[PDB]
Amino acid sequence: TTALVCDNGSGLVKAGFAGDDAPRAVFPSIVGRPRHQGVMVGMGQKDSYVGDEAQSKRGILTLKYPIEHGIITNWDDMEKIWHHTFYNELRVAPEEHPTLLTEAPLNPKANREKMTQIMFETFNVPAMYVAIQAVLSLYASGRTTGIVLDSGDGVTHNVPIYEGYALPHAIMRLDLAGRDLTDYLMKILTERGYSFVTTAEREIVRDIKEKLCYVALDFENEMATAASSSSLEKSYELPDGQVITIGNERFRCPETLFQPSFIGMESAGIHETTYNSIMKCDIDIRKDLYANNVLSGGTTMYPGIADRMQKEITALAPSTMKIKIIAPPERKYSVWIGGSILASLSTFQQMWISKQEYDEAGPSIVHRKCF
Amino acid sequence: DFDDIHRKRMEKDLNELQALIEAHFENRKKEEEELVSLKDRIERRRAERAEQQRIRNEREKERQNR
Amino acid sequence: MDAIKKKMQMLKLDKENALDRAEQAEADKKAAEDRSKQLEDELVSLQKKLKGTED
Amino acid sequence: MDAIKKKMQMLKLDKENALDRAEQAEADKKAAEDRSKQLEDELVSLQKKLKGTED
Numbered sequence: 079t080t081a082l083v084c085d086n087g088s089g090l091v092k093a094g095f096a097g098d099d100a101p102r103a104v105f106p107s108i109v110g111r112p113r114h115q116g117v118m119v120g121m122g123q124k125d126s127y128v129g130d131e132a133q134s135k136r137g138i139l140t141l142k143y144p145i146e147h148g149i150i151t152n153w154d155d156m157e158k159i160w161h162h163t164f165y166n167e168l169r170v171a172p173e174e175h176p177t178l179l180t181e182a183p184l185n186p187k188a189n190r191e192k193m194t195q196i197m198f199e200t201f202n203v204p205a206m207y208v209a210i211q212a213v214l215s216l217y218a219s220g221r222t223t224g225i226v227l228d229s230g231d232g233v234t235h236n237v238p239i240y241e242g243y244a245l246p247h248a249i250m251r252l253d254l255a256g257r258d259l260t261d262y263l264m265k266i267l268t269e270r271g272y273s274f275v276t277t278a279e280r281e282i283v284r285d286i287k288e289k290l291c292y293v294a295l296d297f298e299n300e301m302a303t304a305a306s307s308s309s310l311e312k313s314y315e316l317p318d319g320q321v322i323t324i325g326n327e328r329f330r331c332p333e334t335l336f337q338p339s340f341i342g343m344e345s346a347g348i349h350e351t352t353y354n355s356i357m358k359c360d361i362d363i364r365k366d367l368y369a370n371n372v373l374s375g376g377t378t379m380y381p382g383i384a385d386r387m388q389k390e391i392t393a394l395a396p397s398t399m400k401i402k403i404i405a406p407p408e409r410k411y412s413v414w415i416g417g418s419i420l421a422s423l424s425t426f427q428q429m430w431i432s433k434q435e436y437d438e439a440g441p442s443i444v445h446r447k448c449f
Numbered sequence: 450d451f452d453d454i455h456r457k458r459m460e461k462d463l464n465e466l467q468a469l470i471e472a473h474f475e476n477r478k479k480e481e482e483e484l485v486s487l488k489d490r491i492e493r494r495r496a497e498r499a500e501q502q503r504i505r506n507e508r509e510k511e512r513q514n515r
Numbered sequence: 516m517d518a519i520k521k522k523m524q525m526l527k528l529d530k531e532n533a534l535d536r537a538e539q540a541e542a543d544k545k546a547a548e549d550r551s552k553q554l555e556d557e558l559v560s561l562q563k564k565l566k567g568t569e570d
Numbered sequence: 571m572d573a574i575k576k577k578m579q580m581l582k583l584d585k586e587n588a589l590d591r592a593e594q595a596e597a598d599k600k601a602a603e604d605r606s607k608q609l610e611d612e613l614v615s616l617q618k619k620l621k622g623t624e625d
């Protein structure tokens with residue numbers, strides 16, 4: 079039979095059968111209970127709208143993501159999300175399909191063990207396998223080397239790989255991602271008068287960020303230009319009218335990636351953690367990693383980031399090496415495409431964690447040889 | 450490996466562009482001119498309805514005025 | 516619109532690939548010519564050593 | 571329109587410039603490589619005649 083390549087993510091759940099080009103169903107991972115009282119009788123009001131249904135009734139819900147930073151903080155809601163994904167968005171019972179979840183690097187063990195225990199006890203799948211979210215993004219590019227920066231919505235991690243041999247001592251995981259950029263944008267919009275507070279209006283700020291923000295090639299020059307002319311002010315129409323005008327908030331929101339001091343984080347930007355991740359590698363594979371830097375994940379879709387990052391790394395790196403940044407147009411679904419490719423391989427067909435194996439060793443089987 | 454990138458990229462590099470250009474051309478041709486012509490036709494019918502309404506309103510006001 | 520963006524992306528992929536190939540070829544030329552000129556210098560020193568041996 | 575034409579023409583110009591530059595570089599690389607081969611071949615014989623002279 080065919081395998082189910084699910085990809086929990088944090089912000090958008092992407093799923094679909096193995097062997098295709100794009101995920102079959104992509105929908106936000108939010109579960110929102112209603113918060114008001116409700117007076118109409120017999121309206122058929124449910125107790126929790128999940129997935130894309132709660133992005134249409136969000137006016138009277140309190141949306142809450144079940145995955146904070148890679149890790150899962152609310153297991154009941156995550157189980158609800160998985161149940162919805164299997165039964166309503168794909169309509170395939172899990173009793174007859176292997177599953178291939180994905181997990182960020184350096185995550186707590188208990189999260190992974192609970193994930194496999196749920197998949198084997200509640201949904202009762204035949205066999206499931208957990209894979210690191212960066213190796214798949216490297217599969218999708220058709221490479222076999224390279225250092226991949228997978229800046230998702232929950233957590234940004236940077237896994238270097240050479241000739242198929244991952245370097246476990248050079249993984250640099252940073253917890254700045256799309257959600258923190260949304261919060262920072264929502265916080266700097268208040269400087270013009272627009273106040274978004276409700277958890278429903280966070281979605282509106284996210285839409286503003288997606289449609290308007292861009293990464294500046296040079297930050298100081300843009301700050302000077304936006305403060306003199308008015309060629310940058312782009313307007314946007316809220317879900318009820320009252321258009322708003324975003325000035326130099328456009329390139330200040332995604333600039334947080336390269337200067338995490340804006341949101342008070344100490345660490346260095348995504349332009350310098352990649353160079354540090356490279357320098358921890360051996361001295362003989364640094365040229366190949368320099369030449370095959372891969373971008374993935376949703377948050378790396380800002381217009382103009384593949385040039386800013388290249389300029390920064392070229393500034394840091396030695397002058398002789400060639401710096402090349404691979405930015406495929408299908409960046410958002412790169413991890414899932416790689417997952418489909420991996421699940422479609424014949425050599426991989428014996429790596430699944432078969433159910434009888436789980437019955438013999440318990441949920442701690444995932445840390446064992448079947449990784 | 451890296452030899453299917455050609456056979457999955459170069460294909461859509463030209464076929465997709467040409468097909469989308471064809472789709473845009475046919476959609477514009479089907480849509481814009483027909484819509485403008487139909488709107489003009491409906492406008493002429495609307496003007497004729499306006500004339501009929503004026504005539505009927507005037508004749509009824511003429512008779513009923515007592 | 517829709518197709519226009521994709522066509523621009525194709526034109527940009529061609530841009531990146533052509534530019535990268537040009538730069539790599541230029542680096543190859545620099546390296547090869549340096550190799551040749553160092554070999555020529557070695558040949559010159561051998562000629563001078565032959566001259567001393569002849570003396 | 572206006573923007574599409576100028577951007578497309580400029581990008582195609584960039585691709586053509588990179589391609590021709592790469593071709594020129596590769597031609598010079600091949601010529602330098604062959605000349606280097608000639609230098610090696612002559613240097614070996616220079617060494618042989620030097621060795622005979624020294625004997």
Ligand SMILES: Nc1ncnc2c1ncn2[C@@H]1O[C@H](COP(=O)(O)OP(=O)(O)O)[C@@H](O)[C@H]1O
Pocket residue numbers: 086087088089090091229230231232256257260284287288289375376377379380410
């Ligand atoms: N076109 C876009 N431009 C800018 N940011 C985007 C765009 N699309 C998605 N994002 C950001 O990326 C996030 C989605 O990232 P995603 O790759 O789905 O995360 P995950 O790894 O959990 O799947 C969204 O929250 C949004 O903030």
Ligand SMILES: [Mg+2]
Pocket residue numbers: 087088211228230231375376413
């Ligand atoms: Mg991801």
